[PDB]
Ligand binder design. Structure first.
Ligand SMILES: [K+]
Lengths: 237, 231, 242, 248, 44, 242, 236, 241, 48
């Protein structure tokens, strides 16, 4: 079996393979996630807008479970692998512990898997960064990310992929107690965050929403267009 | 003791497996081998130009039977041909044990090609340096195949491989048609070998094998003498 | 002789299809400094090798290149000595296993093919080097008569009417070819004559009996026998009188 | 040995996998294979690159491989890796059939093969499968489907796509000419012939140089039929008439 | 005696390493020029 | 000569030389010389065991091992590899006695250990042993035997051999002996003489002579030379060295 | 490319040397000084415990191995602990199988073989630790030195680590007395040798010296900060 | 043979000419990039403090845990690549619970630190099993807790060297914090003084301003168990500065 | 004895020149084969 140490410490203490996985993440499509009072919203940029494609097959927001869902930036196939293992682990935890997985538990599992690939023999780190959202059993919304290095943190709102810094600055300047008062305000906040980096509005936005005791809902293009129109009127004033 | 676990064959920046190209170069540098699919058989011919009279021509053979109805010839590195012949015999026997029917020639070609593919991608190994011509008669129809070092198999009606293989292919292209019987195919294969043969070609410096309804068999030197005299 | 990549270090193809490690293994065969000559006749096979004793402190009984594979097959090894001993040990094992599994003694061509397959494995994989030694097996087949076979590091094997391997295999090959083309019905005496004559005319030595080794098999006596100093001296005297 | 290791499964300084990219260049130099999803069927059209007239073409097809009762695929790239991948695809489809006693949904088979390709680009040091496939199928869930796969293990559901030599031009033509949800089997066949005309510029698009197979549904049974020489000739002649009529 | 040979071998190794590094960086420059223009399809 | 083809024992030089094995031999010729001489009734070993610091105890870093009840072992080169090979030889003799039920012939122990060390001259995953060693035994039904094994893995019988820095001088002075007619009681004296001749008192300051014979005098048991006989041998060697 | 003779343990230099072994020897040489002695009835190890900072307790250097044997480490401490665990396991196995203490020389031979194994395999590295092994068995007091080259020495006294040459010089000049010394003046000689390593601005304190003694009727006992005082008093 | 980069010309288990494993030195360099951590072992407890290093206000400090609980009597402050610290924390927890299961007694802090430190150089290549680590852990840990010997503080670096420290500072600002702890430490200083001193040092070394949400402080007293301070409990000591 | 040193220097210079020439030949063959594709070159028999 292959046992070369792909990820090794470089001088100055950098793990180059992890940094390169992060660079691959930086070239992925922008993904934004915002945690509201009673709704959690995930949004992804679609550079692959090409019209000869089945939108169902390139979804970048996947439901890890009935109460957990994630969006990724980076390599698509590695994201598929991590999503599949996360679903398997969710179902295993539900058998063994009787209860639905908390968001932080599956986030820890995904982070541990990425870190293990960072340090195990003969495999490169996962070139994906995630945004694991969902609701806990006690009704507390959550939002985490998992970088390729394996570090996971909780965020009120974050962006991964290209334009992460721009959208992160926008969210810093535009995440207040009022901006997440209602569901529509959260939807519009995520859409406005994406519009800071997407080429054209509406057509390049994939937006999924999760609220209490309801499964993930993929907002259809018509709803995205009507929301974007609402931001257009709001910006006019 | 543990072998390397990484592919020696990898994609070049041009987008091409250079090791397979170099294996094909070794194939193109070997003794010419020709195969002609007649309407009632197929002939496999190659030259046995030993580099001294000291070599015993009957000691080693380049046209090796695999089953009672399949034979093969190569153009490249002899030891790799021996390895692939042994593996093809193993695969044929496994098929016979499973299905109690002689292995179809297409199936044997597919399995040999799978072995070649394995050696193209597996760790610490180099691709085989032989292209095979697998001949067989089954389902009342002659067959002729060519398996390049990469493991890609092509159905052929007539082909030449080795030195002057492009000129031999042009020769065959000019002088092959559907209605050839086995004897005409043998004559044409001998002429194709002659087209690149250097010096006088005799019984012991060419090896010819045929397969028909009666099955596959190497032509004995006396029969090759009879066919050579016909020119 | 183009080169790109590690093709001169591990057994991978050069751009012209050449494996340079195999050719370097042939050079390693040459590195031994000795040459060996084998020739078969009507009812015998003879292997004659160059026996050099660099130091008078060696036990000359323990410096040999003729090895008895089985009770009926002989072997002369040219090249690196440790590799040659590995190959002879492997040949002994394969022959014994053949007898155990199949109930009859291994044919010489079969043993040469097994050793050649092992050599091919060496020249296919990348982590072990080929053995820089060459094997010349002799024996009597029940149906086909005397057998002379040779296997080189490339994995090639073939039967020979008369062959040679070592530092002077080309000159010996030319001489044996000139003698073979005549086809004058070799006997045991004539076979040992032509082997010793080839070795001497190529090396220009005129051996005393202690500078060569002779191993013979015969249809009358299929036992492999390593000729002693008396027999070799008798043959050399026969050379001298002519 | 680290000296001889080619480091196939590592990242580049700029964060890309060189081996996958090189395999994709190899595929981009391979035979053109395009598929079009129609309302009543889905078809695969593949340029044959070996045209030499000493070939026999004994088998069912040379590019189109039947994967199960209800699915088929084409290949652009290395043929031997294609063979191992298509064998693995057949194994996966039959494993679902054994486990669930029903045909495998197309996306599941694509996902399994793509997961294997991901494994080969994730660990082990082995070179990736330089094969991009082009799947056509049908299932009781999403009807007629067309799927693309990449050496990196990526896949996408396409309604019209082309892989191989001159793939970009074919994709542009398909984008211009594909009519959403209004393309029948005959319209798709005509579009395929037209696209292959401007893709095989050098070869002038004879019927001996293309292999077309259609997947339709008849009486609850899926039929995968390779188009005959006569009817491919008819398609080409009809396209020639239409091209001449354009001059009018 | 042997030290002179060792020093000459070290100098030769250093020079060969410099030339080989030049070759490696040149190939890397060509590859980065070649594959930088188009975006990777797999990353998304 | 190298710098591109000397990185692994699994690589052949363009002229067919495995440079790693040659570097192991270079390692073994930079060690203190160990000599062994075979006589009518046994073999006597001798070692110029240098004392690197005087803080060591007399008998530290022995180079005369005892691999079986009737086989000795003199070593030169890296002592870690010498001890590892001593354990390998001990295990081979133990396994031989366990399976075949009698003492291993030294002609077979030498072959087994030589093949073991040859296995390390083929692969890039291992390195050749940096120690050449001698084996010596005496049995009434097989006589006195002396064999040398070098990093390549070649085994030859010797009437007398030397391994280490002063191999050439030791062999030159051993040839002056007539060991074929002498006995152990005199061969030990001459071994001390040879070791003291080949030693240089200006480069390596101090050394202690380590002697051991196996032979008829010891019923086949390989024993360290008794203290009184060692004192007499050193007395003779010093007087001769004048 | 690069020096191509230094990275791998399985690559011989054209001079017949393995540079990785020498680099592990350097690892031993960079460690803090240890010095050991032996009388005809005792074997004493005294080590110069080094401190990372003025607020950090000094590293333990004498480690228990068995009822009747002990070691003093110098080099990589994790390698030292792994080799110490191997030694302890071998001693316990000898006590289990034979119900007798394991002879010191045989234990050192096992250490030599175990440390030689990685000397010859690809990817492996030499044990970058040098061990001063002092034990008492039927053959009297023993002191041993083991190098990363898997070569071990039967010593009468030895010092390994940083500035060890001064301690070795002191030991050489005063070897003749060690045999007839009692425990107190034997450990005084050891402390003098260890002081010879220290620079001019420092001297032995109960903080930076540890003493391990094994003898005829003496459990191997490591003497620590408070307990070193009776041996320390009376040097200078 | 071209395009090969010198990143992998050396193996993982290769020595430098100065006798230091290259990977261990690189992991030590990685330690100097982590958040600063401070630990003081007083006679009435052990205190551990670490900066959170909040990159952006959207990140919740409650999630970024750089101090953890090995058991009721052991804590751990981590600096460096926190992703690598979790394997060691899990191993320490497993060892503590195994020791309780087997012996019915709390495992000594020194024994826990030793058990975790044995993992530090257990990394390699093909020589080992598939589950073997490929690189040293880029984490320095400050184990602190109370046991039979009293309050204890330990420091383990990637080299596997674990050493008992009266007061140790690790991370980016290790040197300045260590000099300050030298200036302030007395063998008879109380736990309240230790906490105040540690927070003062953190304020001196932190780039961000010290507040109740950008540090974590925990104590292990000979009485009560491992305790994580909170808001309404960390302001009560931050205000004094 | 300096004559041997000068001879060694000359041999080292010649060896360096030969090694540089061989390395350049290897590099140019590498560039021609693995890189620098030709537009008019159809792929080999194994690409289909
Ligand atoms: K090889």
């Amino acid at each position: 079996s292959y046992d070369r140490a792909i990820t090794v410490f470089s001088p100055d203490g950098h793990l180059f393979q992890v940094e390169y996985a992060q660079e691959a993440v930086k070239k992925g499509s922008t993904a934004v996630g915002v945690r509201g009072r009673d709704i959690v919203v995930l949004g992804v940029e679609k550079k692959s807008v090409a019209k000869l494609q089945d939108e169902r097959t390139v979804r970048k927001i996947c439901a890890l479970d009935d109460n957990v869902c994630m969006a990724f930036a980076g390599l698509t196939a590695d994201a598929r692998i991590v999503i599949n293992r996360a679903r398997v682990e969710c179902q295993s935890h539900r058998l063994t512990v009787e209860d639905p997985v908390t968001v932080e538990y599956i986030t820890r599992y995904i982070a541990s898997l990425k870190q293990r690939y960072t340090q195990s023999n003969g495999r490169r780190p996962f070139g994906i960064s995630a945004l694991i959202v969902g609701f806990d059993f006690d009704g507390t919304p959550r939002l985490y990310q998992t970088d390729p290095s394996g570090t996971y943190h909780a965020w009120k709102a974050n962006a991964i992929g290209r334009g992460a810094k721009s959208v992160r600055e926008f969210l810093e300047k535009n995440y207040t107690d009022e901006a997440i008062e209602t569901d529509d305000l959260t939807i519009k906040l995520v859409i406005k965050a994406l519009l800071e980096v997407v080429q054209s509005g509406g057509k390049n936005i994939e937006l999924a929403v999760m609220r209490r005791d309801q499964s993930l809902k993929i907002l259809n293009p018509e709803e995205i267009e009507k929301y974007v129109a609402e931001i257009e009127k709001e910006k006019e004033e | 003791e543990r072998g390397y676990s990484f592919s020696l064959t990898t994609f070049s920046p041009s987008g091409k497996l250079v090791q397979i190209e170099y294996a094909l170069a070794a194939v193109a540098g070997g003794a010419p081998s020709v195969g002609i699919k007649a309407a009632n058989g197929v002939v496999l011919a190659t030259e046995k130009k030993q580099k001294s009279i000291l070599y015993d021509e009957r000691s080693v053979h380049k046209v090796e039977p695999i089953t009672k109805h399949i034979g093969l010839v190569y153009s490249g590195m002899g030891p790799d041909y021996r390895v692939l012949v042994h593996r093809a015999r193993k695969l044929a026997q496994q098929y016979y044990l499973v299905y109690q029917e002689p292995i179809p020639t297409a199936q044997l070609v597919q399995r040999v090609a799978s072995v070649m593919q394995e050696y193209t991608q597996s760790g610490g190994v180099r691709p085989f340096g032989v292209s095979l011509l697998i001949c067989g008669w089954n389902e009342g129809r002659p067959y002729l195949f060519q398996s390049d070092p990469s493991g890609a198999y092509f159905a052929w009606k007539a082909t030449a491989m080795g030195k002057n293989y492009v000129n031999g292919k042009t020769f065959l292209e000019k002088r092959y048609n559907e209605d050839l019987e086995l004897e005409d195919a043998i004559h044409t294969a001998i002429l194709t070998l002659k087209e690149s043969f250097e010096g006088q070609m005799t019984e012991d410096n060419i090896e010819v094998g045929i397969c028909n309804e009666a099955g596959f068999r190497r032509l004995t030197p006396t029969e090759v003498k009879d066919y050579l005299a016909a020119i | 002789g183009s080169s790109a990549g590690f093709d001169r270090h591990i057994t991978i193809f050069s751009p012209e299809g050449r494996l340079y490690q195999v050719e370097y293994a042939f050079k390693a065969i040459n590195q031994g400094g000795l040459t060996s000559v084998a020739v078969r006749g009507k009812d015998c096979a003879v292997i004659v090798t160059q026996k050099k004793v660099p130091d008078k402190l060696l036990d000359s009984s323990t410096v040999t290149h003729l090895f008895k594979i089985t009770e009926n097959i002989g072997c002369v090894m040219t090249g690196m000595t440790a590799d040659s001993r590995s190959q002879v040990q492997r040949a002994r094992y394969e022959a014994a296993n053949w007898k155990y599994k199949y109930g009859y003694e291994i044919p010489v061509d079969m043993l040469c093919k097994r050793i050649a397959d092992i050599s091919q494995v060496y020249t296919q994989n990348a982590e072990m080097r080929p053995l820089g030694c060459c094997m010349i097996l002799i024996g009597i087949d029940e149906e086909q008569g005397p057998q002379v076979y040779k296997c080189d590091p490339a994995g090639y094997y073939c039967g020979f009417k008369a062959t040679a391997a070592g530092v002077k295999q080309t000159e010996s090959t030319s001489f044996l070819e000139k003698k073979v083309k005549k086809k004058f019905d070799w006997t045991f005496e004539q076979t040992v004559e032509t082997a010793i004559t080839c070795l001497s005319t190529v090396l220009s030595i005129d051996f005393k009996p202690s500078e060569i080794e002779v191993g013979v098999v015969t249809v009358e006596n299929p036992k492999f026998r390593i000729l002693t100093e008396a027999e070799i001296d008798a043959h050399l005297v026969a050379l001298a009188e002519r | 040995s680290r000296r001889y290791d080619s480091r196939t499964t590592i990242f580049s300084p700029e964060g890309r996998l060189y081996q996958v990219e090189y395999a994709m260049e190899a595929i981009g130099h391979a035979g053109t294979c395009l598929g079009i999803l129609a309302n009543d069927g889905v078809l695969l059209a593949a340029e044959r690159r070996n045209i030499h007239k000493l070939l026999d073409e004994v088998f069912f097809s040379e590019k189109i491989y039947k994967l199960n009762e209800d699915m088929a695929c084409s290949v652009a790239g290395i043929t031997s890796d294609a063979n191992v991948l298509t064998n693995e695809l057949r194994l996966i489809a039959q494993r679902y059939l054994l486990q669930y006693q029903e045909p495998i949904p197309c996306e599941q088979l694509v996902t399994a093969l793509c997961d294997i390709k991901q494994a080969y680009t994730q660990f082990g040091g082995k070179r990736p499968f330089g094969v991009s496939l082009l799947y056509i199928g049908w299932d009781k869930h999403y009807g007629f489907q067309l799927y693309q796969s990449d050496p990196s293990g990526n896949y996408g559901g396409w309604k019209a796509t082309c892989i191989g030599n001159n793939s970009a031009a074919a994709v542009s033509m398909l984008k211009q000419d594909y009519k959403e949800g209004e393309m029948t089997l005959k319209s798709a066949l005509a579009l395929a012939i037209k696209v292959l005309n401007k893709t095989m510029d050098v070869s002038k698009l004879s019927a001996e140089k293309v292999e077309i197979a259609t997947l339709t549904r008849e009486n609850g049974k899926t039929v995968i039929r390779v188009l005959k020489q006569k009817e491919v000739e008819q398609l080409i002649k009809k396209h020639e008439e239409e091209e001449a009529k354009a001059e009018r | 005696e042997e030290k002179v040979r060792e020093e000459y071998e070290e100098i030769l190794n250093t020079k060969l390493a410099e030339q080989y590094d030049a070759f490696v960086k040149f190939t890397h420059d060509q590859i980065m020029r070649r594959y930088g223009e188009q975006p990777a399809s797999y990353v998304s | 000569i190298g710098t591109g083809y000397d990185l692994s024992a699994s690589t052949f030089s363009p002229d067919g030389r495995v440079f790693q094995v040659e570097y192991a031999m270079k390692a073994v010729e930079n060690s203190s010389t160990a000599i062994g001489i075979r006589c009518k009734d046994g073999v006597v070993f001798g070692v110029e065991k240098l004392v690197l610091s005087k803080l060591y105890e007399e008998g530290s870093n022995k180079r005369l091992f005892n691999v079986d009840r009737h086989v000795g072992m003199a070593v030169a080169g890296l002592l870690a590899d010498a001890r590892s090979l001593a354990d390998i030889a001990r295990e081979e003799a133990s396994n031989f006695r366990s399976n075949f039920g009698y003492n291993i012939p030294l002609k077979h122990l030498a072959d087994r250990v030589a093949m073991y060390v040859h296995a390390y001259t083929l692969y890039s995953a291992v390195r050749p042993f940096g120690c050449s060693f001698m084996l010596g035994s005496y049995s009434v039904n097989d006589g006195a035997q002396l064999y040398m094994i070098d990093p390549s893995g070649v085994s030859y019988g010797y009437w007398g051999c030397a391994i280490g820095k002063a191999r050439q001088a030791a062999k030159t002075e051993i040839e002056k002996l007539q060991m074929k007619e002498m006995t152990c009681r005199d061969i030990v004296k001459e071994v001390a003489k040879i070791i003291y001749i080949v030693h240089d008192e200006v480069k390596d300051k101090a050394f202690e002579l380590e002697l051991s014979w196996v032979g008829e005098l010891t019923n086949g048991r390989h024993e360290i030379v008794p203290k009184d006989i060692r004192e007499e041998a050193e007395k003779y060697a010093k007087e001769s060295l004048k | 490319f690069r020096n191509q003779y230094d990275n791998d343990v399985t690559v011989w230099s054209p001079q017949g040397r393995i540079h990785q072994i020498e680099y592990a020897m350097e690892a031993v040489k960079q460690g803090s000084a240890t010095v050991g002695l032996k009388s005809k009835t005792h074997a004493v190890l005294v080590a110069l415990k080094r401190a990372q900072s003025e607020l950090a307790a000094h590293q333990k250097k004498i480690l228990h191995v068995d009822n009747h044997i002990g070691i003093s480490i110098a080099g990589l401490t994790a390698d030292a602990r792994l080799l110490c665990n191997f030694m302890r396991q071998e001693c316990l196995d000898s006590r289990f199988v034979f119900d007798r203490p394991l002879p010191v020389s045989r234990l050192v031979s096992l250490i030599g073989s175990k440390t030689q194994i990685p000397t010859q395999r690809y990817g492996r590295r030499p044990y970058g630790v040098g061990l001063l092994i002092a034990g008492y068995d039927d053959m009297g007091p023993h002191i041993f030195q083991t190098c990363p080259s898997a070569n071990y020495f039967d010593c009468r006294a030895m010092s390994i680590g940083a500035r060890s040459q001064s301690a070795r010089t002191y030991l050489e000049r005063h070897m003749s007395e060690f045999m007839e010394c009692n425990l107190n003046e034997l450990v005084k000689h050891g402390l003098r040798a260890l002081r010879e390593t220290l620079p001019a601005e420092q001297d032995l304190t109960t903080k930076n010296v540890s003493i391990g003694i094994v003898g005829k009727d003496l459990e191997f006992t490591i003497y620590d900060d408070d307990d070193v005082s009776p041996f320390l008093e009376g040097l200078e | 043979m071209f395009l090969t980069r010198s990143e992998y010309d050396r193996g993982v288990n290769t020595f430098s000419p100065e006798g230091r494993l290259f990977q261990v030195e690189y992991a030590i360099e990685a330690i100097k990039l982590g958040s600063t951590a401070i630990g003081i072992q007083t006679s009435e407890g052990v205190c551990l403090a670490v900066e959170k290093r909040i990159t952006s206000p959207l990140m919740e400090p409650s999630s970024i845990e750089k101090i953890v609980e090995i058991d009721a009597h052991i804590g751990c402050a981590m600096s460096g690549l926190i992703a690598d610290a979790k394997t060691l924390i899990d191993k320490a927890r497993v060892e503590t619970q195994n020791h309780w299961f087997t012996y019915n007694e709390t495992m000594t802090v020194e024994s826990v630190t030793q058990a975790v430190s044995n993992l530090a150089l257990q990394f390699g290549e093909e020589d080992a099993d598939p589950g073997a680590m490929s690189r040293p852990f880029g984490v320095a840990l400050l184990f602190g807790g109370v046991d039979e010997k009293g309050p204890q503080l330990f420091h383990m670096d990637p080299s596997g060297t674990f050493v008992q420290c009266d007061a140790r500072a690790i991370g980016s600002a290790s040197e300045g914090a260590q000099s300050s702890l030298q200036e302030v430490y007395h063998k008879s200083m109380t736990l309240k003084e230790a906490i105040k001193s540690s927070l003062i040092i953190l304020k001196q070394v932190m780039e961000e301003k010290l507040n109740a949400t950008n540090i974590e402080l925990a104590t292990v007293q000979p009485g009560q168990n491992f305790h994580m301070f909170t808001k309404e409990e960390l302001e009560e000591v931050i205000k004094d500065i």
